[PDB]
């Protein structure tokens, strides 16, 4: 530390919680972005970014696609609690990343029952649910980084 | 995302949606354009070839009459076979990067040509495709092998052997590993036996052309002239089809590219075409 | 897996590529020189630009 | 979707040919075992035959079916004495087979009575000629893959 982000190089100024599942535990490890087969000349930086709506479209790889509002179904959110700095750039490999959703308790966004949606890069916006939506149907005592089972 | 699958972040540095070609082919095995082509119609193939004739022979004493002969033939059946390859594509990806589209077609064509040579020689048949020509043809000629003689030497030595046989030879049909190994296993001189290494000899051996077909297998060399041994009947030629009306591609943005041909094989001299396996 | 059937198991011609991003890069070296030594010795200046250019 | 039928993609098991009837002995006036009935190895139609039944088309080679069913001739439909076929091409053992002609259980192929023509998949179906010679069990409507005693 501090501000490091490499140079030997441990903080890493980004902490993302592996929230263990419920009724038998479930995990999923941080996913890389690669198009088809496994990345050559390093695998680059993660497809997943803390505070972003992604969907796996490949087994060990995660990519773009945004879950459309209307008729309640499961997760594929992979919201991870926001890190400090780098919040409109995504998060780079060598910082803390995970996936949270799908058979486990998740990280929520938005304070009260008033919710809106998330951009990929780590920013939050307002917006009503009318062609896209993020996160489960609101419950009592739901704030940012709170544990909803979905 | 913040990147497509990139190494660094676009937001930090670097912009562009223009990107160069990365896709490339591996393992050529052409022999169909080398061979002659025919049209065919019909849903199965029957071929007839002539066997040896039954004539009389007199190794001792000539004054008598040789026994007469008549044209005797043996049959082969060839069912149609289907040669294909499929590609799953993402149109958004294709339109943005740019060359992928051109690469896919030219690769599919090469790929059809490649698979066809493999089944025709042999590459595991399930009794649903053209017969395994490589098996049926003449065994290993022990005579060529001078006992403890170089691999490259074997390929030179074999070429002449086919000329003694009275079968046309224009060219060497060898396996890729056997050819490399043949080049590497040369005498005690830098100069190779086919011709020196200051001449281009990568693609020619014995002063005759080299045809690389895969699945002719290691330690085997087959001399022939390709046109003569076999002939290629084509039931339907190579055609691409592209489908966004297929069930699983429709739902998605994805487009499915099929590349296929339906082929058949004729054997004009499957009862001959010399081959050897090194015993050296 | 090479052709052996039609619309059971089919072989794939499919080739895959990923995009990677390259930043602009710098190769550089600096040489520090004092004018007095350089001025009296006389070829040092010229020697230093060529030797530096080559070195990097 | 997509289902093979015949041609070495159907498994018909194995059945014993020394079961039922009188059993002859090993002798000549046989014929060769191969895939194809005038074909060559790895190229032959095939019924729902396993062990029992195989009809010469050209040459003195056998594999299942194929031969005009207006007239059956050659002495029975040919049966195997003291080797049991280990393929499900009908016969295609890869040896010269010594055959017999005692009453001996066979495997049939194709719907309806054989008194017709040949279908080029390795089956019998009804042709323009009727009241032609039948095979094995009579008085009884035969179907595709029936077990007949000759």
What is the Cα–Cα distance from D118 to D64, expressed in whole angstroms?
11
What is the Cα–Cα distance from A136 to A102, expressed in whole angstroms?
12
Two tokens, residue A57: 């479209």
Q: Do B259 and C3 touch (CB under 8 A)?
A: no
Question: Cβ atoms within 10 A of the Cβ of B147, count?
Answer: 7
Task: Report resolution (Å) to 1 decimal.
Answer: 6.1
What count of Cα atoms within 13 Å lies in the side-chain half-sphere of residue B53? 9
Distance (Å) from the alpha carbon of A123 to chain C's nearest alpha carbon: 23
What is the Cα–Cα distance from A75 to D80, expressed in whole angstroms?
64
CB neighbour list of residue A79: distance below 8 Å, 6 or more residues apart: A50, A51, A52, A53, A100, A101, A106, A107, A108, A109, A118, A134, A135
Place of tokens 């195989």: D54
Taking contacts as CB-CB distances below 8 angstroms, the residues of chain C near B24 are: 15
Two tokens, residue C34: 């004092």
Report the run of H or E that residue B243 belongs to, with start and end: strand B230-243
Q: At what angle do helices B151-165 and B176-184 cross, to 10 degrees?
A: 120
What is the Cα–Cα distance from D14 to D88, expressed in whole angstroms?
7
Place of tokens 């938005």: A110
Distance (Å) from the alpha carbon of B111 to chain C's nearest alpha carbon: 6
Contact map slice: C 7-26 vs D, CB within 8 A: 7-8
Two tokens, residue B144: 């060529």
What is the Cα–Cα distance from D53 to D15, expressed in whole angstroms?
12
Report the run of H or E that residue A149 belongs to, with start and end: strand A148-149
SS3 for D81-118 is CCCCCCCCCCCCCCCEECEECCCCEEECCCCCCCCCEE
Tell me the sheet residues that pair with A32: A46, A61
What is the Cα–Cα distance from A63 to A46, expressed in whole angstroms?
10
Taking contacts as CB-CB distances below 8 angstroms, the residues of chain A near C20 are: 41, 44
Two tokens, residue B279: 């015993």
Contact map slice: B 163-182 vs D, CB within 8 A: none
Quick one: closest CA in C to A41, which residue?
Answer: C20
Quick one: closest CA in C to D3, which residue?
Answer: C8
User: Contact at 8 Å (CB) between B138 and B273?
Assistant: yes
**Helical spans, DSSP H, in chain D:** none
Q: In chain C, what is the straight-line distance between the N-terminal and C-terminal CA atoms, in Å?
A: 50
SS3 for chain D is CCCCCCCCCCCCCCCCCCCCCCCCCCCCCCEEECCCCCCCCCCCCCCCCCCCCCCCCCCCEECCCCCCCCCCCCCCCCEECCCCCCCCCCCCCCCEECEECCCCEEECCCCCCCCCEECCCCCEECCCCCCCCCCCCCCCCCCCCCEEEC
Two tokens, residue B91: 């149109």
* Whether residue C55 has a cis bond before it, omega within 30° of 0: no
Q: Report, in angstroms and rounded to the nearest whole number, the Rg of chain B calculated over CA atoms.
A: 25
What is the Cα–Cα distance from B184 to B193, expressed in whole angstroms?
11
Phi, then psi, of B179 in degrees rounded to 5 = -65, -45
- 3-state SS assignment for residue A71: coil
Two tokens, residue A148: 């909803």
Q: Do B127 and D44 touch (CB under 8 A)?
A: yes
Cα C40–C44–C46 angle (5° rounding)? 125
Tell me the sheet residues that pair with A93: A95
User: Contact at 8 Å (CB) between A45 and B6?
Assistant: yes
CB neighbour list of residue B245: distance below 8 Å, 6 or more residues apart: none
Distance (Å) from the alpha carbon of D66 to chain B's nearest alpha carbon: 13
DSSP string, A36-69: SS--SSS--SBS--SS---EESSSSBEE-----S
Q: Calculate the CA D54 to chain-centre distance.
A: 3
What is the Cα–Cα distance from A5 to B162, expressed in whole angstroms?
70
Return the biggest CA–CA distance within chain B.
100
Interface test with A, best of C16, C18, C22, C23 (most A CBs within 10 A): C18
Q: State the Cα torsion A144-A146-A150-B1 to the nearest 10°.
A: 40
Q: Do B11 and A45 touch (CB under 8 A)?
A: no
Report the run of H or E that residue D149 belongs to, with start and end: strand D147-149
Taking contacts as CB-CB distances below 8 angstroms, the residues of chain D near B135 are: 41
User: Contact at 8 Å (CB) between B8 and C23?
Assistant: yes
Experimental method: cryo-EM
What is the Cα–Cα distance from D85 to D99, expressed in whole angstroms?
12
């Amino acid at each position: 530390p501090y501000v490091r982000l490499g140079y030997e190089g441990i903080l890493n100024g980004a902490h993302d919680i592996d929230v263990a599942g419920l009724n038998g535990v479930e995990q999923l490890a941080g996913k890389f972005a690669t198009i088809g087969a496994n990345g050559v000349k390093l695998a680059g930086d993660n497809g997943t970014n803390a505070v972003g709506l992604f969907r796996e479209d490949l087994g060990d790889m995660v990519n773009a696609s945004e879950k459309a509002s209307f008729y309640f179904r499961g997760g594929e959110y992979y919201v991870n609690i926001s890190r400090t700095s780098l919040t409109a750039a995504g998060i780079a490999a060598g910082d803390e990343i995970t996936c949270d959703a799908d058979g486990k308790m998740i990280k929520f966004t938005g304070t009260g029952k008033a919710l809106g949606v998330v951009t990929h890069v780590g920013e939050y916006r307002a917006g009503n649910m009318y062609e896209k939506a993020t996160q489960g149907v609101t419950d009592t005592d739901t704030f940012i980084g709170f544990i909803m089972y979905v | 995302m913040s990147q497509l699958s990139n190494q660094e972040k676009e937001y930090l540095i670097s912009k562009a949606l223009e990107t160069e070609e990365g896709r490339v082919a591996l393992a050529q095995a052409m022999a169909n354009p080398i061979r002659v082509s025919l049209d065919y119609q019909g849903v199965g193939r029957k071929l007839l070839v002539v066997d040896p004739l039954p004539q009389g022979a007199l190794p001792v004493y000539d004054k008598d009459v040789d026994a007469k002969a008549f044209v005797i033939s043996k049959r082969g059946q060839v069912p149609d076979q289907v040669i294909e390859g499929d590609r799953i594509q993402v149109p958004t990806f294709e339109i943005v990067s740019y060359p992928q589209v051109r690469f896919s077609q030219v690769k599919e064509r090469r790929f059809n040509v490649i698979d066809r040579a493999q089944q025709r020689a042999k590459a595991d048949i399930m009794a649903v495709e053209d017969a395994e020509i490589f098996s049926l043809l003449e065994g290993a000629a022990t005579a060529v092998n001078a006992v403890t003689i170089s691999s490259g030497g074997l390929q030179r030595a074999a070429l002449t052997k086919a000329f003694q046989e009275v079968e046309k030879h224009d060219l060497v049909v060898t396996k890729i590993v056997m050819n490399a190994s043949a080049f590497a296993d040369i005498r005690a001189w830098g100069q190779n036996e086919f011709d020196p290494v200051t001449q281009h000899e990568v693609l020619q051996t014995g002063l005759f052309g080299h045809i690389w077909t895969a699945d002719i297998l290691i330690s085997k060399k087959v001399p022939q002239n390709t046109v003569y041994v076999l002939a290629d009947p084509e039931f339907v030629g190579v055609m691409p089809i592209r489908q966004d009306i297929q069930v699983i591609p429709a739902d998605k943005p994805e487009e499915l590219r099929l590349g296929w041909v339906i082929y058949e094989e004729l054997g004009l001299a499957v009862v001959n075409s010399l081959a050897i396996a090194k015993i050296s």
